[PDB]
Design a protein around this nucleic acid. Structure first.
Lengths: 70, 53, 56, 141, 56, 63, 201, 62, 143
RNA sequence: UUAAUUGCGAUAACGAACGAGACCUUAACCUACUAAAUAGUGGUGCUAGCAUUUGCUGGUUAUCCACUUCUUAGAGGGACUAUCGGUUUCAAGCCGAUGGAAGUUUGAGGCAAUAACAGGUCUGUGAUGCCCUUAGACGUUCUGGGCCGCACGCGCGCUACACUGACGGAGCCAGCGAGUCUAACCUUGGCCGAGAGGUCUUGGUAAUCUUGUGAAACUCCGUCGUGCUGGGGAUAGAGCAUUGUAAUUAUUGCUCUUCAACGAGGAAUUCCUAGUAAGCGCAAGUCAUCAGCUUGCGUUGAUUACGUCCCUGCCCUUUGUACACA
């Protein structure tokens, strides 16, 4: 494919351990962990926000910023 | 463009004429208009009556 | 030209003008464009007082 | 027989006519509340005349702003100025010059367009250029 | 009528220019210092500012 | 890492091919009465502090 | 604190700005001081403001842009590489983001960390072409001017052909500049201009 | 470039040497003195002339 | 207590009126939908393509409300954007007619828009009622 | 000293003229005058919706009342470096602060000397000397062709090499124009159409209608995720329209498909100091049709000087010269 950007239901399990203990979370960080690429990074952020491991500080389109759950 | 031919630095003339319009609304009878319009004739300032109100 | 142009610049100055200018350009004295400029009094050149008082 | 003053504020071809009247607190722009101005960051430029003095001073008036001309930013700066100039013109006429002074040096302490329009205007375009200064490229050889 | 004033002043402006050049070409020998056009009800009065009128 | 802060007391025209450098007179904030002449690059008003990485060497015009 | 009512209901977060303090709507200019002398009276952190956008008559006479709030000076210097010339609304939105970014990681109130980045990325001795090079000192206004012009150029160059958006790059650059790293087109690019200086100094 | 020319600096000197009384160390009065006494063509020429008569009247009183 | 179309935000209103006009199967779809890009000067069709139309319908409803009377020409030159003419400079080519005409007809049949004198189209009294009802719900849904 | 042969002054010089300045247009200020159904506004009335108490948001160019804040153009007013402090023999001046719409000649132009070029134009001119042709015409008419032809080189441009982005939706605001009668203009509005564009009416000889030219960049929500990729849109293929006696060497527009170079550019070189550069589009000129051009206008709006002769030139004086088409 293109540097580990593949659709998976196991890297769901990889995400939901690796994403917490991040001081900062955004599309840029998710992709720069050689994970899910862009389209999949955004819908990962949206599901992590529904689940409530993420606190959204700002949610502007094109630049969504997030933090670890208190 | 200033020059009659093409040659020379590209200098441009902007000749600007002005036209001023005025707008009077009288409640005159038939008596006055046939004197006021027949008088007050001046060169360079052309006046028209819209006597159908 | 030097007689006719001085004859008319002297008429204009006597008529009651502040100044006059006559410029005669063209092939004067066997084929070479020469500007002979006969003037008396004061002639302004710049600003609107050109448009005000000066006639061309 | 009502306190009512018609003011305007402007920033580069943007005319914002404010109508500050004796009321409760109806501050509205093009028949919509100030809380909905097109640029959502310039929400705090239209608002700052209120946050400068306090909403307590606006607890007994109603303002209606009609904006025409310019662009989005021109129109926000026009509203801001029109509201501040409206409020000081009301306080001058219907309270006293004491409280007018108070909120004039309140408004001009925090730096201003705000009371009097920036003098700046666009310079006309001259030949042999794409603007007032920028000349076309020169071709020696 | 109907012709726009924006255009119609220029139209009778060009009338003056053609008049000035017609008399500047024809009546230039009996003197000439311009024309004037006064627009009246049922009349447009063109007045020649020329010298010796016994020949103009 | 000793960097010496010194306020300017007077500006003295401009040196260099162009007016890129301004010759200035500074007074050392630390252990004052010491007045030294120095070169700057950017625009200098008076009362402005410059950070010297050497308090020693004097300044000459840039012919 | 004193929640007033009007015929136009204003939200309480906006109503907590009236003379309370002027922030962005969260970043305070009480202040964690500039802390480095020579640049005090050259960084404006004394006049608090709501947005990083004034009409501004700051390029009027000479030193007037020293009395412009330093947040606007970043916001201004982010509009370069002229596909973004003008467009201050985009630039202030990027500034809003990068500030709440350098909050969410390494909080420190995201104005004093921006100020500290200006104090650290300022080239403090440079050279002049007099093919010779003569080492001269730097005016504190130019130390700010070039500190901004290194941070904001480094940011766009990092964010160019990348996934890291200008907000996150500028953010990372301001953090590593504040805490002297030499890993942000930063202290590295400044040391390169003080290295050519110490040759002739 | 706020240098006054001879056309104002001569008119001013003629004005003060004639009306030294009826000239009072104030532009706003000297402006209206020039309106009444002189036949100056432009409004802006008056303001420059009157502004320099005032400058001369302040200097003559030291 | 006097919430109108103007008292509520632009997008946050149109999105709730989009939900409402989709729940109701009352407003028509011209049938050529899925094969149009609502312009002469665009690249690709509307990305949603699940009847956007319910967003046009909503916005033409909200626009005709705020204005006095709107014609199809005003909607075309409104919705039309900058056309990339290839290597030539960008222009203004106005949006597609049929989409804006057939959505006005769809509002006319539903009873939102009324064929108005002076030409163009005004709002119906039923139109103002339905718009203001949604406009009140939108705000109190958050509150 | 000055933007300045602008001035203070010193003085075989004294007294003058031109140019600079002045002047004029223009862009900003005018809770002041003078008026506005071709500009608005606040009121009543006929009312629409949400509320229910009064209150909000609208409609009504032929329902009346009132004024002039906005807008328009008249006569004017205001700024003269005004006041204060510095500062030069305390002279012209200059610098700083304050007030003010405005403190650079207030911003920008127009006008613009003497002398000069063998600068361009005889293809703008019933401007013109001479020379050439004068009908098998070198006159102007008709048909078609060419000014567009392509190994290659150069100059102004436009589009881009993307994530500060593209695309889709929604949000949604200017300013200067121009526009038809015995003609075909600007063209609302409703229908047909995926288009482009057609139809049947309509307002405007125009602050009345086009037109608020609800322009684009821009804003927000979402779809693309570092790949010549959906960046880029060149070349080509086929079709549908419009203008035009005529579209082939494809006028232009529109639909689908074809997808090239281009990963920010070597030696060089251009323009620019504030509402300026730059981005963005808009209107006008030619115009039947054709703008990647120009003339103007606003929209968004920086960085960096506030300096100096280093380069390239300028102005004045001194000086050397074998130069004077210098």
């Amino acid at each position: 494919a293109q540097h580990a950007v593949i659709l998976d239901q196991e890297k769901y399990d990889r995400i939901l351990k690796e994403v917490p203990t991040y001081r900062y979370v955004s599309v840029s960080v998710l992709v720069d962990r050689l994970k899910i690429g862009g389209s999949l990074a955004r819908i990962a952020l949206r599901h992590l926000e529904k689940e409530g491991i993420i606190k959204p500080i700002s949610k502007h389109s094109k630049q969504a910023i997030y933090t670890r759950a208190t | 463009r200033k020059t009659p031919n093409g040659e020379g630095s590209k200098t441009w003339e902007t000749y600007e004429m002005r036209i001023h319009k005025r707008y009077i609304d009288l409640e005159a009878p038939v008596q006055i208009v046939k004197r006021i319009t027949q008088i007050t004739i001046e060169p360079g300032v052309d006046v028209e009556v819209v006597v159908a109100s | 030209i030097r007689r006719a142009a001085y004859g008319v610049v002297r008429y204009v100055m006597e008529s009651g003008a502040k100044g006059c200018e006559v410029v005669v350009s063209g092939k004067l004295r066997a084929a070479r464009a020469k500007a002979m400029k006969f003037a008396d009094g004061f002639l302004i050149h710049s600003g609107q007082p050109v448009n005000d008082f000066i006639d061309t | 027989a009502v306190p009512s003053v018609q003011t305007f504020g402007k920033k580069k071809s943007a005319t914002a006519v404010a109508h500050v009247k004796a009321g409760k607190g109806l501050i509205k722009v093009n028949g919509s509340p100030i809380t909905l101005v097109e640029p959502e960051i310039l929400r705090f430029k239209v608002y700052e005349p209120l946050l400068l003095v306090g909403l307590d001073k606006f607890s007994n008036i109603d303002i209606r702003v009609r904006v025409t001309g310019g662009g989005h930013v021109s129109q926000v700066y026009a509203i801001r100025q029109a509201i501040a100039k409206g409020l000081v013109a009301y306080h001058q006429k219907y309270v006293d010059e004491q409280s007018k002074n108070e909120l004039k040096k309140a408004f001009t302490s925090y730096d201003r367009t705000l009371l009097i329009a920036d003098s700046r205007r666009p310079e006309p375009k001259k030949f042999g250029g794409k603007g007032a200064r920028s000349r076309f490229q020169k071709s020696y050889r | 009528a109907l012709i726009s004033k924006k255009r119609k002043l220029v139209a009778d402006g060009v009338f003056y220019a053609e008049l000035n050049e017609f008399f500047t070409r024809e009546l230039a020998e009996e003197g000439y210092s311009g024309v004037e056009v006064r627009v009246t009800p049922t009349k447009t009065e063109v007045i020649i500012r020329a010298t010796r009128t016994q020949d103009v | 890492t000793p960097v010496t802060l010194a306020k300017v007391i007077k500006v003295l025209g401009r040196t260099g091919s162009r007016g890129g450098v301004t010759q200035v007179r500074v007074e050392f904030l630390e252990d004052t009465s010491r007045t030294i002449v120095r070169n700057v690059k950017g625009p200098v008003r008076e009362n402005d502090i410059l950070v010297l990485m050497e308090s020693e060497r004097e300044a000459r015009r840039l012919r | 604190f004193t929640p007033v009512v009007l015929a136009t209901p204003i939200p309480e977060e906006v109503q907590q700005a009236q003379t309370e303090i002027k922030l962005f709507n969260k970043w305070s200019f009480e202040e964690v001081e500039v802390k480095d002398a020579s640049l005090v009276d050259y960084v404006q952190v004394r006049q608090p403001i709501f947005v990083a956008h004034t009409a501004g008559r700051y390029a009027n006479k000479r030193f007037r842009k020293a009395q412009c709030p330093i947040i606007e000076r970043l916001t201004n210097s982010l509009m370069m590489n002229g596909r973004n010339n003008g467009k201050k609304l985009k630039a202030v939105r990027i500034i809003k983001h990068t500030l709440d970014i350098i909050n969410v990681l390494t909080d420190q109130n995201p104005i004093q960390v921006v100020v500290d980045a200006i104090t650290n990325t300022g080239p403090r001795e440079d050279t002049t072409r007099v093919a010779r090079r003569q080492a001269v000192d730097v005016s504190p206004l130019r130390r700010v001017n070039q500190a901004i012009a290194l941070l904001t150029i480094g940011a766009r160059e990092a964010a160019f052909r990348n996934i890291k958006t200008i907000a996150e790059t500028l953010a990372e650059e301001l953090i590593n500049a504040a805490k002297g790293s030499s890993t942000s087109y930063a202290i590295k690019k400044k040391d390169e201009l003080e290295r050519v200086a110490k040759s002739n100094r | 470039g706020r240098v006054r020319t001879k056309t104002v600096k001569r008119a001013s000197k003629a004005l003060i040497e004639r009306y030294y009384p009826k000239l009072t160390l104030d532009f706003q009065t000297n402006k209206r003195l020039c309106d009444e006494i002189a036949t100056i063509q432009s409004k802006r020429l008056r303001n420059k002339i009157a502004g320099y008569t005032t400058h001369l009247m302040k200097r003559i009183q030291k | 207590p006097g919430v109108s179309v103007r008292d509520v935000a632009a997008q946050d209103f149109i999105n709730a009126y989009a939900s409402f006009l989709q729940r109701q199967g009352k407003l028509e779809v011209p049938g050529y939908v899925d094969i149009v890009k609502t312009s002469s000067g665009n690249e690709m069709p509307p990305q949603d393509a699940e009847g956007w139309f319910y967003k046009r319908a909503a916005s033409v409803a909200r626009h005709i409300y705020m204005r006095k009377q709107v014609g199809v020409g005003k909607l075309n030159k409104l919705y039309g954007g900058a056309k990339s003419r290839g290597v030539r400079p960008y222009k203004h080519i106005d949006a597609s007619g049929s989409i804006n005409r057939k959505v006005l007809q769809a509002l006319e049949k539903i009873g939102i828009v009324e064929i108005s004198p002076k030409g163009g189209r005004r709002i119906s009294e039923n139109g103002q009622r339905d718009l203001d009802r949604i406009a009140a719900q939108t705000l109190e849904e958050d509150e």
